[PDB]
Design a protein around this ligand. Structure first.
Ligand SMILES: CCCN(C)c1nc(NC2CCN(C)CC2)c2cc(OC)c(OC)cc2n1
Ligand SMILES: CCCN(C)c1nc(NC2CCN(C)CC2)c2cc(OC)c(OC)cc2n1
Ligand SMILES: C[S@@+](CC[C@H](N)C(=O)[O-])C[C@H]1O[C@@H](n2cnc3c(N)ncnc32)[C@H](O)[C@@H]1O
Ligand SMILES: C[S@@+](CC[C@H](N)C(=O)[O-])C[C@H]1O[C@@H](n2cnc3c(N)ncnc32)[C@H](O)[C@@H]1O
Ligand SMILES: [Zn+2]
Ligand SMILES: [Zn+2]
Ligand SMILES: [Zn+2]
Ligand SMILES: [Zn+2]
Ligand SMILES: [Zn+2]
Ligand SMILES: [Zn+2]
Ligand SMILES: [Zn+2]
Ligand SMILES: [Zn+2]
Lengths: 258, 257
């Protein structure tokens, strides 16, 4: 029996609801954090938002030509007309993506705008048998589709150094910064690690181009089938620390942390 | 002959297009500014965005009850079920409005969220006969409706002190201004009227830094389809510009003619 413990963990802040179900145990919907749909701060982060520091394009079309400066900052625009990454996109070593912004001459519906349009896929928080909560897709997701952003509290490395919990940390890259999704986060905080992951994180710039503060967008690395759990590779720093305490349960025949 | 010089001056950044028409002269659509749908900065404004500094409500409903703590911040929520200001709203002395935010327990579709849902009314930039460009409504607007935000570049009082062009300034109160001269939305084109159909209301949404209210224009009366929008620029504007020109609003009670 699959109980519905929340019809929407986002309380309407996403384009569609993100329900939560539990077919495993009696645990209620998680409530020891606050859902936020965009990154937040406690202590101030001096993100450079001077509008005159944005690089921008002067395109008179839909930004599908090689002359778009935003595509050139991205090496090329990697988006097809449906917002999916081109097959040539390097999933193993992704470039920086510079989406168009409000300084550009183009319209809000131009080709180079995907992550700034926000989560679209139908996701569901659910109780796994042996890895706590996880996130699954309720629909087929084609390859190269934007799935969700890793959203949370932006903090300095020195602030991360003095927090007891580091199990919900994403390192952004001298002065380095982190997204801590422990106390404030979106759906991405519940995604478990997989060693052959169906999501890859991509560093993206949209409303600002402060290179210290990429936003982290997960794109699908393959066709994700309806019902599949999402996963990304937490990376070597997470496992250098947590491997002391537990081993990976992703179950991949190519698992690297078992 | 009414020429359509732009189907949408906002290039798709608003919920609806804002066309521009000219039935008066040769002038093409204005292009000596950059349209933005939300406030921007050049020099940094240290707006307090610490999420733990937000006051918030714990409502278990749609925030239509007497107990919503966000409504209490204005003594009460002033929005009805259609998002319009209650008849008792004091147009002559508007309170500060604190809308719900992401720290509240309520849902994103609660009652206390209007200005944060963005411009909805069907507006049009057009060429007036004797006041340059103006903005008109294409639809009837009932009283108390959110029409548009005064959007532009947030600058300090000392920065405004050294800017030559001051015809697109809105004063917020160590005071700040919105300068819509170089970056602005549709509101930068609204002309002054001495009996205005718009009133500016100070609103707080994603942050509650009292130095930086956002300026939301609400209708003071039923605005008729085709009517030009206007607000009262105030005494500081006319104390300065009265030296150069007189008011052309045409009101029989005009105060700056
Ligand atoms: C530039 C360094 C950024 N910093 C400080 C950091 N620290 C982590 N952990 C601890 C922080 C608290 N101190 C008591 C011990 C170290 C940490 C843990 C991660 O995963 C378990 C992780 O995954 C991606 C990234 C992490 N990043
Ligand atoms: C909080 C900052 C208040 N400040 C500095 C200011 N200055 C204005 N104007 C000038 C700026 C350049 N100096 C040479 C002379 C004064 C000004 C003009 C306005 O409308 C004609 C107005 O309308 C609402 C508001 C204005 N506000
Ligand atoms: C960001 S959380 C994922 C959400 C978590 N499952 C929960 O219930 O809140 C990361 C934590 O989940 C568990 N986890 C995630 N991936 C795992 C994996 N591949 N193997 C074992 N545990 C994993 C570990 O406890 C890890 O510290
Ligand atoms: C913020 S702008 C309004 C848009 C302006 N009509 C334009 O074409 O850009 C303010 C300027 O418009 C003109 N204006 C606005 N209201 C006026 C009024 N009631 N009487 C005379 N001129 C007015 C003045 O030149 C004023 O400095
Ligand atoms: Zn372009
Ligand atoms: Zn573009
Ligand atoms: Zn661009
Ligand atoms: Zn593994
Ligand atoms: Zn409430
Ligand atoms: Zn509230
Ligand atoms: Zn509310
Ligand atoms: Zn007048």
């Amino acid at each position: 029996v699959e109980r519905i413990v929340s019809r929407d963990i986002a309380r309407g802040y996403e384009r569609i609801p993100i329900p939560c179900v539990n077919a495993v145990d009696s645990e209620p919907c998680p409530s020891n954090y606050k859902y936020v749909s965009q990154n937040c701060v406690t202590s101030p982060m001096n993100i450079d938002r001077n509008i005159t520091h944005l690089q921008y394009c002067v395109c008179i079309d839909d930004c599908s030509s090689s002359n778009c400066m935003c595509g050139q900052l991205s090496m090329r625009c990697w988006y097809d007309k449906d917002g999916r990454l081109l097959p040539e996109f390097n999933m193993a070593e992704p470039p920086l993506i510079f989406e168009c912004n409000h300084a550009c001459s183009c319209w809000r519906n131009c080709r180079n705008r995907v992550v700034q349009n926000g989560l679209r896929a139908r996701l569901q928080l659910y109780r796994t048998r042996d890895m706590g909560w996880g996130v699954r897709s309720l629909q087929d997701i084609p390859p190269g589709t934007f799935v969700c952003e890793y959203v949370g509290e932006l903090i300095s490395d020195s602030e991360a150094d003095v927090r007891e919990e580091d199990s919900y940390l994403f390192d952004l890259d001298g002065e380095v910064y982190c997204i801590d999704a422990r106390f404030y986060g979106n759906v991405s905080r519940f995604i478990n690690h997989h060693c052959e992951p169906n999501l890859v994180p991509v560093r993206v710039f949209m409303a600002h181009q402060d290179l210290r503060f990429p936003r982290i967008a997960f794109f699908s690395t393959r066709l994700i089938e309806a019902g599949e759990q999402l996963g990304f590779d937490y990376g070597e720093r997470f496992w250098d620390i947590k491997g002391k305490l537990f081993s990976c349960r992703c179950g991949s025949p190519k698992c690297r942390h078992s």
